[PDB]
Design a protein around this ligand. Sequence first.
Ligand SMILES: [Fe+3]
Ligand SMILES: [Fe+3]
Ligand SMILES: [Fe+3]
Ligand SMILES: [Fe+3]
Lengths: 307, 307, 307, 307
Amino acid sequence: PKPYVAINMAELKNEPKTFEMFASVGPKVCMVTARHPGFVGFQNHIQIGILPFGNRYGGAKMDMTKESSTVRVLQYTFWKDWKDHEEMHRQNWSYLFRLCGSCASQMIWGPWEPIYEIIYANMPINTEMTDFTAVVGKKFAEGKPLDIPVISQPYGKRVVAFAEHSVIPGKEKQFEDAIVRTLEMLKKAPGFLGAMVLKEIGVSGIGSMQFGAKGFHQVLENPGSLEPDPNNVMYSVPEAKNTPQQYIVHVEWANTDALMFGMGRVLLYPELRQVHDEVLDTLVYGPYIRILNPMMEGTFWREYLNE
Amino acid sequence: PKPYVAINMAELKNEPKTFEMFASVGPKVCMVTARHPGFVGFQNHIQIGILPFGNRYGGAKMDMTKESSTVRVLQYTFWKDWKDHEEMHRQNWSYLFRLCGSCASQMIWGPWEPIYEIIYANMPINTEMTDFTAVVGKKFAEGKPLDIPVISQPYGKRVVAFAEHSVIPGKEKQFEDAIVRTLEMLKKAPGFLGAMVLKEIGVSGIGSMQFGAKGFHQVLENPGSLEPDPNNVMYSVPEAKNTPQQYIVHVEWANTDALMFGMGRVLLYPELRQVHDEVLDTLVYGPYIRILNPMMEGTFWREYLNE
Amino acid sequence: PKPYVAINMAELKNEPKTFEMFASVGPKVCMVTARHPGFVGFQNHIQIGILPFGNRYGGAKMDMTKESSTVRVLQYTFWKDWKDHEEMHRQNWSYLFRLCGSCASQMIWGPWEPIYEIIYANMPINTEMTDFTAVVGKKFAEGKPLDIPVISQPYGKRVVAFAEHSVIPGKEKQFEDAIVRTLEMLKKAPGFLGAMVLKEIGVSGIGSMQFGAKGFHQVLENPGSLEPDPNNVMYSVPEAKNTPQQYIVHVEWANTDALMFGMGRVLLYPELRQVHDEVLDTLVYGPYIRILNPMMEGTFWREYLNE
Amino acid sequence: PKPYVAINMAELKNEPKTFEMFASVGPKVCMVTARHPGFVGFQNHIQIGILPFGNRYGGAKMDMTKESSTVRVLQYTFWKDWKDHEEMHRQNWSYLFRLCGSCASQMIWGPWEPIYEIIYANMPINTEMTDFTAVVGKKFAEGKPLDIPVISQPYGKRVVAFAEHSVIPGKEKQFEDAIVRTLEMLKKAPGFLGAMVLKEIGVSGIGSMQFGAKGFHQVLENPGSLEPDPNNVMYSVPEAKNTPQQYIVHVEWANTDALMFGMGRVLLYPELRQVHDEVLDTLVYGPYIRILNPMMEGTFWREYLNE
Ligand SMILES: [Fe+3]
Ligand SMILES: [Fe+3]
Ligand SMILES: [Fe+3]
Ligand SMILES: [Fe+3]
């Protein structure tokens, strides 16, 4: 079934010490989240650049890692029910806060953790290049050759287009119908590895370290080993849901060229351009497209999705 | 009277070429906006850093300009009626679009231009250190020594704390009452040069280059001298107003130390901490505090403000 | 069905500034061409070298990019009807001319844009190495394993042999019959990714910036933002068709070794050599073979071709 | 059938001279062992690093080869009957001892050669990327597409997780049941190339150069060409079997990322975590996971395994 998605967002200094603590702390956080039975997996991204759209963002490029002073992370966690995420955070607060707190020395902005429902998904299981022979064999044995997916390689060996959209109030239905039509046509592009549409349903205060006054002072005053009152979150997840409605259109690609010209198909192929024009007519903000590298992931979230 | 405020936000490459075109294009844009009789001035900022809040944002410091790969600009324009801003853009579209278009090669994100109402303002006219003798003389001659302001130096010789807040729906009145009480007490801090509270009323589609499909293609395809159809904006300013409600708390200071410890008074002075805790209890997001340098400005906006 | 092909040819300085504007202007031109419903895609090439034929062109080699002072571009655009190309140019002249005009500082020769009919095509859809599992699955599901193509990777991950021929008047039928026989046999060579034969039907005056006196002076005198009169083109496309008849034999290959020895099959394999000798007997000029890298492309032109 | 496994372990100086004599002497030893008809193959490993488990072993990383002063070897030889191994050593002692003796100048610890029975095996034949077409063709021809394996590339082109476990006396049955359930689920991870569980049955005294007093002095006093009395080994293989019972869990992976996150599946996937927790409850020591590179191997041992 379709899981819910929490996306933890933050911006940190682009330096070795940051990536070192990614390697130490990251696995720990993931292991703690896996204590909850509603946890079905994760996909953690580093932003490597921004899609320039010709020279609309002429200062950007798809890979800005060698020049950027900061690094943005987007950590997806997947949940059977979005309430599982909230429960997991509270049940494991002593660990999560202290783990996430150790990132402080590198932090510039965040954490900020919106919650999403998946309203459309065409996402395959991941496989390594070593796997495809056994997959093909099994699918033919089952008489289901149509269920043979593309090869979507895990652990940093593909790229993601993270397209931000906010929609004019009242035009949500038009956006959702048109974007699904768009993605159904987009899958013809070479190197297309899957797409899903995420619709924000709210924000996790606790995941964003957004407390009332009491928790705010505890966060600021913390020596590192004393958690804020997790009960001092002043709003529920849906209470923080944004209007204009926010969506993420998440599209995966074999490589950044396939991404650039593949996403470009909505501009370059007249038949698809006409369909995607219906998406553009609904927007308050966007499309703004971040280029992401899915480096650390628990690939079994796609097994839950596709069962 | 209180003007409305448009704030044009963008992120550009932090390099000499960016600042060179600031010097060339900036004045032109300002001269064009001054064509509209509703224009009462401007205050253009560069972000120089982020308030770290101890080590809450331990990767940040108040002046990150020497290390940052990007520069964020926040360009305030002041208007008798916010509709003046929208009309100005449309009436002078051929000039403005082609001027702002020349920034493309340096752009990474933006432009994004929310519109605000001022719900509280305690902001003096600017004066240079050369002016204060005449100001003192004039005010005593008129029998109005209470009207002698602090010395708030224009053109990059003071700093701004730009504090972002979003508020839980239903708590706006609690937020506004408490933040005004806070700022009324905050003005006692040494080096305090004024404060105002900005409340978002919407977003300018045209100022944000956010069009329907037609305008979107015209923007991407533009050689530099062909404006998109300005009539292709699909939403009004109020249709894009965010819920949760967004506020900017804008506080000006003599220098970055006075800023750090002055803003810090809301944490460090128990009486004020109690008042400001009422603000904290209302928030979905924030406070997130950007450190700004007001470099280019038309100081007469404060003359309109203070009559 | 078979589309018509326009090939825009130009020679520019081989330096970073040229490739930077390829990246800036290129996408824009492509987005503009896609405004016309008869546009079915594109394939843009950079020449990387010349096939030396042993030492017939002993000063040449297949990759001369590190030593050449110039770079030649060959930009294919594909059209349902060749008149669509002409119509597109005229309808979008203000954008196209200003876009192409910005290349001026790097230009040494061109643009020159002959138009071609395709008289033979054996060209597969492009696929990334990630795609083939799904393609195989789909074709077996449909009971059409013979329709499983070779893997022809898009976006610079294969190479093209661009073979220029001009034919003795009266020998066109012999050339065409023999070259098709040749290519039908050539497809047995390892790493063969497809072939097509293009027959010139004329030249686009507007795409070649070839006007009468009025337009000529407008081009020379242009500050960059004032298009020449597009009605000052003095000849129709067929009026410029060359006699001797010109052809392009366009053959795609996995890599430059497969290209060299694969094309060489028409000299090295006695049975194929006898067939290809019938081609050679018809020539006024050629074969002259440019080595091309297809870097930027709209791969959906092959979907139109093979539907 | 399942062969028995002898694993020769040693630690040597990490320098070119060590690898040079690996290349000279290594093949010789393998040729001598192949004199015995019970020999069914071998898989020789170099340890390239240690799995850090987040920062549990924070001084370790998966590839420590550029920094380490030593290199550990683990040389698997496979035998129809474990007694064949003992027989081979004694029958060919003059060659083996003089061959292994030439390693002396580089040795820091070892040799130590435990013997194991395989209690679980899910291990495919090796294939190069060049082979899979013919493999697929053959299996479909035989009507057995389910017997198409993953591509497990020989000769250094994959990696091994070498997981050491020792089990509480009385808990061997629980360990063995749980670890098999674990590995049966683990095979779902991307890039999983096979697994087996080795259970120690004893230690080869002769393979470990562990003699009585007489042989000890002969070893120490040897000029290089005088073997110790091979009959002076004072214990049989089973007499040296350890309690607590020792196991090796041997898992092969496409690459070190697939290894890290794949092995990590027993921590990150809740369903598998519950199963694997039953393994953890039985342990005296471990899991300690060495990262191995299978460089030199006789791949036909897997043909014997899978018949
Ligand atoms: Fe979370
Ligand atoms: Fe504006
Ligand atoms: Fe053209
Ligand atoms: Fe041995």
